[PDB]
Amino acid sequence: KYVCVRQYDLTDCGAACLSSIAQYYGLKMSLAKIREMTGTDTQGTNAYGLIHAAKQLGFSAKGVKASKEDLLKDFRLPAIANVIVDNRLAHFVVIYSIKNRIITVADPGKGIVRYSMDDFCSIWTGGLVLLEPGEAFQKGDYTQNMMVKFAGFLKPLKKTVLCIFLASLLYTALGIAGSFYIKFLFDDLIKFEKLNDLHIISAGFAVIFLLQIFLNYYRSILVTKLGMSIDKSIMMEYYSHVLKLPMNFFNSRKVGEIISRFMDASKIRQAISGATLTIMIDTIMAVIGGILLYIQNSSLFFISFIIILLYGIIVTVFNKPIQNANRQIMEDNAKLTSALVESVKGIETIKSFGAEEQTEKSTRDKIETVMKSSFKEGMLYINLSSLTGIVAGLGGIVILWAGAYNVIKGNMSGGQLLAFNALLAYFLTPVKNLIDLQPLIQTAVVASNRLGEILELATEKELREDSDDFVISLKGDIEFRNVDFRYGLRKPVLKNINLTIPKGKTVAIVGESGSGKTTLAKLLMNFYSPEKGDILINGHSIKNISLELIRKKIAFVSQDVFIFSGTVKENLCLGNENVDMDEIIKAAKMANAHDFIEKLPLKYDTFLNESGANLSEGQKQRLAIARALLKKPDILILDEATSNLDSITENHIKDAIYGLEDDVTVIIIAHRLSTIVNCDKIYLLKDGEIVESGSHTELIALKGCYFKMWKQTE
Amino acid sequence: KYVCVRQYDLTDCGAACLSSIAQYYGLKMSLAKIREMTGTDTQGTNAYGLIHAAKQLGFSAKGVKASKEDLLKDFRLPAIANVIVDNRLAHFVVIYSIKNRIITVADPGKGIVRYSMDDFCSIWTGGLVLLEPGEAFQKGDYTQNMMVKFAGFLKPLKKTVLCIFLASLLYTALGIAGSFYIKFLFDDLIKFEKLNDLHIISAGFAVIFLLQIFLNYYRSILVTKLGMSIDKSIMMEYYSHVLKLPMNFFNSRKVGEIISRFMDASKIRQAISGATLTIMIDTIMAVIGGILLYIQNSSLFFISFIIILLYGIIVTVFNKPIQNANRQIMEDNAKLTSALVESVKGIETIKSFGAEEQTEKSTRDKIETVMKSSFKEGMLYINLSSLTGIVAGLGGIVILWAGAYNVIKGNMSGGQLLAFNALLAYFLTPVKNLIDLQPLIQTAVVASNRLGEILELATEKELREDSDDFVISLKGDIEFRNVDFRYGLRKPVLKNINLTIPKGKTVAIVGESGSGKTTLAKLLMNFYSPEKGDILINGHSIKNISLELIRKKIAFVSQDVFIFSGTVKENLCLGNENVDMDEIIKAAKMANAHDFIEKLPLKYDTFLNESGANLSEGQKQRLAIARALLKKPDILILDEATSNLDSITENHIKDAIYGLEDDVTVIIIAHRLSTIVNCDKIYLLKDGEIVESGSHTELIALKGCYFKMWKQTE
Ligand SMILES: CCCCCCCC/C=C/CCCCCCCC(=O)O[C@@H](COC(=O)CCCCCCCCCCCCCCC)COP(=O)([O-])OCC[N+](C)(C)C
Ligand SMILES: Nc1ncnc2c1ncn2[C@@H]1O[C@H](COP(=O)(O)OP(=O)(O)O)[C@@H](O)[C@H]1O
Numbered sequence A, B: 001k002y003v004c005v006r007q008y009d010l011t012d013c014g015a016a017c018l019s020s021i022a023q024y025y026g027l028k029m030s031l032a033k034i035r036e037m038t039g040t041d042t043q044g045t046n047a048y049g050l051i052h053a054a055k056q057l058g059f060s061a062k063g064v065k066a067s068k069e070d071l072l073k074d075f076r077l078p079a080i081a082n083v084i085v086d087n088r089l090a091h092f093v094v095i096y097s098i099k100n101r102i103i104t105v106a107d108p109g110k111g112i113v114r115y116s117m118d119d120f121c122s123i124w125t126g127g128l129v130l131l132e133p134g135e136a137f138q139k140g141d142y143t144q145n146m147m148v149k150f151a152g153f154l155k156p157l158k159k160t161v162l163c164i165f166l167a168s169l170l171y172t173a174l175g176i177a178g179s180f181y182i183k184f185l186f187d188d189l190i191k192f193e194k195l196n197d198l199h200i201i202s203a204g205f206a207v208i209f210l211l212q213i214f215l216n217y218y219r220s221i222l223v224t225k226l227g228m229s230i231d232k233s234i235m236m237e238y239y240s241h242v243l244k245l246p247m248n249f250f251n252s253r254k255v256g257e258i259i260s261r262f263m264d265a266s267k268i269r270q271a272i273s274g275a276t277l278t279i280m281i282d283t284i285m286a287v288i289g290g291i292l293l294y295i296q297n298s299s300l301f302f303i304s305f306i307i308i309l310l311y312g313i314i315v316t317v318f319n320k321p322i323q324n325a326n327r328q329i330m331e332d333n334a335k336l337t338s339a340l341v342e343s344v345k346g347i348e349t350i351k352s353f354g355a356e357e358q359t360e361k362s363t364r365d366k367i368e369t370v371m372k373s374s375f376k377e378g379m380l381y382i383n384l385s386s387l388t389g390i391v392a393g394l395g396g397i398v399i400l401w402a403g404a405y406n407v408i409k410g411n412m413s414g415g416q417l418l419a420f421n422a423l424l425a426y427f428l429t430p431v432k433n434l435i436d437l438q439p440l441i442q443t444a445v446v447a448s449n450r451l452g453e454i455l456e457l458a459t460e461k462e463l464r465e466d467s468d469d470f471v472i473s474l475k476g477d478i479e480f481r482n483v484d485f486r487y488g489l490r491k492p493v494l495k496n497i498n499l500t501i502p503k504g505k506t507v508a509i510v511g512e513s514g515s516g517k518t519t520l521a522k523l524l525m526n527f528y529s530p531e532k533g534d535i536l537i538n539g540h541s542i543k544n545i546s547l548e549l550i551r552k553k554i555a556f557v558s559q560d561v562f563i564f565s566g567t568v569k570e571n572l573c574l575g576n577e578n579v580d581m582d583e584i585i586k587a588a589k590m591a592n593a594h595d596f597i598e599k600l601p602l603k604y605d606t607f608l609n610e611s612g613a614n615l616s617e618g619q620k621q622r623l624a625i626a627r628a629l630l631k632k633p634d635i636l637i638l639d640e641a642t643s644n645l646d647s648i649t650e651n652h653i654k655d656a657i658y659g660l661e662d663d664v665t666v667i668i669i670a671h672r673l674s675t676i677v678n679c680d681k682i683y684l685l686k687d688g689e690i691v692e693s694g695s696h697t698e699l700i701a702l703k704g705c706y707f708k709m710w711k712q713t714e
């Protein structure tokens, strides 16, 4: 069988292909784990990541660039081929069989498809990855059934589910009892002209219906409460786990990918609470209805069974094409909305270049594509509805025909036929719902896998080693031994930095843009870990210091500061909750912010709308600096904290942090060389290694890269 | 009556309040016209904007701060009051009546509400705007009916609407004829034991049903085609008008506000093609069904009429609360999504400050609020469904009861009762749909107004003056006369900006961040117009040159560069539709971009994913510079176009610009002073003024702000 693992996101096509190959060869594991192994980033994965993950997964993989002629030759069928769609997006596919000019490929985006050779090589890039099990490829099933894990949420709520079951049973029994009103009307009351009996029986059936309505009300309230509880539990569990995952999880994913998993909570709930309750109620409901129908007449029961069989066959046949059309519509709508967002976000360039006519044409073409996909799905739905209506109406007419024939033959009465028509609802609707549960359960299973593969990921605290409790301070020499680092599986950023930062000293790191300075700042702060080597504080390894203390004694002022929607009192007290106002005022004094914030409306409680969109960039930078010095750190890192600020405020903060109390280490990452000349030591980093060090005068005396940069920049 | 104009967006509370006041006083205008009159930006309007718009509208408006005791006294009741909603939003409300300690206020976000004086004063800021009509307040109704305007898309589609109407009439007639099968069964066939007649009549009714199904198929296909056509037409008209609007429309609105009308298009279409057709079909079909039911039996028809009256009353009663609950749910979901996006985007700061615990608490609280709103709406729906089910089921039971009574009394037969039960569908479903049209029509009207206020806005071309056809190029001295400017209604950016760029000589403009240099760059390109004075080229006013020529002969490289999703060639040729590859290569060389593009996969057709997300900042900026020089301009503006470049590329672009042929004017807006020294003339901008002009030699010698900044920044 050709395994085709669906891709959950837009950037895990290669991971999906590798998972498909592994499952075909007998190894099934989490797709999130493989996506971590392949070094998948926000820009998808590449061939090298696939080969590396296959090699370290047990396979014996290799890469090869081949033309169309090489495909005619013989080799291992299950290979991964890099393809390009629409002179556009680059995907990966799994070739499963090279037949006569026709190639079967599993594409994670679409499914199992057949491409003729010519168009395949038109879209297939020359790259190719060959896989084959090696010496150590122990087969396994390292994954867990995730519907059971989420269904375990029903254990605390067994009292609510039990009441729903009883209410549903009583509702069904009352409805079945009340469906015989039409039988009692024609066979007994109308025929014999009984009036008092008519009134009494009608009043009794009205009371029965009112009881049925009350039971439905109670059951609906209970079901709504159960669904809300399950939704809240699932969303809160997912969010609580996500907030603890390491930093390499957030930089390998987009905001949309993380946020969209919340809808998966409702998708799972719709089958955890809905599908199970529907099954339990409708199985007994349909069994009772079928027994009663067979009691009424066997032939009519068989006719109704044939009707429901035809309905189920039609629905099962139409299942997959409808979901394919829905996926295509979703893709087209995403493309159209992305184009609209891009064209309205860069409207200034379009206006300047006079491209308002071609943008309109492109948008119209995308709208046409969306309409074509919508028409395809609508035609599918119309065909399905027409077939279902034919089946239902012709079955009803045939049931009436056969019932009239049976009444004529004397096998049954007219009231019995009308009672059969009434019980047809209580027999067919449960089975109809049971059949219709199939599309919901598949979507719920997909969402359960998508949301629960993340829950298996180890958090940041679980990956840490054993910590030594005798360390209570981070004051001391900061030693960078031979440190390697690379963001995932890209080219290395840091190669052989080996430096020492003395305690209580103002140290500066300068270099070209995109050279590995912010990377060093994040490495010191324990975001990510060095691939090779160690980082030491006061002679102690960075891995042996508790994560809570390491994040509480190191303050960061990033290049792209972030301010959350809230009061200034809350934006300046993100971590701690018990802090005096005097400390906040003192912290804002050194950042040249208190005078600015005082001019704002009210006091240190003004709400910052839209992540501080009313704020300006320099003001937010001052706020971030104030927060950093408010944290009272042992090490303070300023990653270009004065890039936007004017000369006066920059000088003010420079003299403020220059004369700080206590032996608090200060590191300043600078792009403009003239900004800092008074730093105790200056480190020159060019392409991932330090080349020069010392005081500013010392590097000037020693002719080298620093002097050339100073001369060409000043 | 108390007028309460609801707000269409999140930033038009003050505009909605002013519109409500005007409508209360007899003047009705478009909300978009008022919104642009108030100077509403993306952060909303304030008291000054409302006062200015009211004075422009003929009112005699004033602004004053009021205390709690001030409300005790008497003043003009219809006044706008600034309030603070949930310590987050600076909203505006319209006070209408001051009753005994209870204040009636129209809030555009909620409706007409009543606040206790204590609670209001707790949520009411001291500010107050008093409005009163002046000498010139000629009333009117300066707006059009958007529903009638959007109903004009049915004119070319009058043939399709006619086919649908005829098919629906035939379908309804066939169904009404086929509903008598059960009447023929019991009164004629079963009673008299007719078998061959039974088979013949059953076959005939089956054929009738098949014809009905075919008619439904054809009508559904036509309806789908009609809906798709109308939706596409509305969407394309809206986008075509939006692309032609001035820039003050695009920077006063968010991206979401502009994009959200593409769903309003579908909302309008749902009533353009749904409401009219439903009315036309259902009125006639309900009339026929009611006449037939009255023919069958008068008392049962009256019972069914009472049933449908009760259903309509219940639906009308439950209309408003359901939509209020839905709006509340939408607001809460939007808040939760915004919080989730904020938390995910700023995960680095949360981790660095160890604030995962409190972010989880805030998200849980927002989830709880969402669940509360969801439960309120669910309970409203449960109550509505229970009442409707009671009415329907008890009506059916009562109809069966009264029909049996009439059959016993001899006023009708059993088959007549069964036929009445059958025709109950064709009588009750039409009126049910007509009653259910109310939520669709109101939402469609709101969406139509929202989408059509924009279409009344004047485009960029319509606001221009007469164009001089004798102007063919913009090569000449560029004179800024006494020029004032201010974005929207904020603090003015330029005061007396007066300067002269010589023809063909490279000139630089320097200053602080947020000083008003990019504003000058936009002003020279007809984005926005100066409040006072004129801008001239070669003695010709900027307002007398065709907008097509101005945008064609001026090239702009903004501080932020936008790259559109597409091949490099398409981006480099955004405006012109015809150009040879040699010029593209030549332009790329002088911007130091050709070498980078060569190393990319493919040569120049490399599609740039996600608006060029693959490229770096320097690569994007070099590509934009290449595009601008490819434009072949007469004036080239570089608004900080060398910031992200390294020194080598900076020098290459610098001496490429200095090596430009022809007398092409070059303007360079520079932040770093050292970046430009060789410019022919330098203008210094500090506060909306040029205080010092000249080359580097004289400006350094002359003591002033430029000398101080050069000394303190180098
Ligand atoms: C909650 C949602 C409910 C929605 C339904 C809304 C309606 C609800 C209420 C409906 C009741 C009122 C509607 C009319 C009912 C009688 C009509 C009829 O048969 O015609 C006859 C009624 O004249 C009579 O003789 C009266 C005797 C009543 C017969 C039994 C009716 C059973 C309905 C159960 C009662 C309702 C229980 C209420 C429970 C809901 C007239 O023709 P006749 O045969 O010649 O009459 C002989 C005497 N005569 C010559 C003097 C006239
Ligand atoms: N989040 C990320 N994911 C993948 N690669 C990154 C990320 N951030 C930076 N890089 C890469 O690492 C290199 C180092 O950049 P960085 O150290 O951030 O520059 P700077 O030191 O100027 O802040 C860059 O060339 C960039 O391509």
Ligand SMILES: Nc1ncnc2c1ncn2[C@@H]1O[C@H](COP(=O)(O)OP(=O)(O)O)[C@@H](O)[C@H]1O
Pocket: B041, B251, B487, B488, B490, B493, B512, B513, B514, B515, B516, B517, B518, B519, B520
């Ligand atoms: N899109 C806008 N809407 C409203 N006000 C703006 C907008 N852009 C700029 N401003 C205001 O006008 C001034 C113009 O500054 P600007 O020329 O952008 O500075 P710079 O030359 O450093 O880019 C700014 O101080 C800002 O407050």
Ligand SMILES: [Mg+2]
Pocket: A514, A518, A559
């Ligand atoms: Mg950086």
Ligand SMILES: [Mg+2]
Pocket: B517, B518, B559, B639, B640
């Ligand atoms: Mg600028």
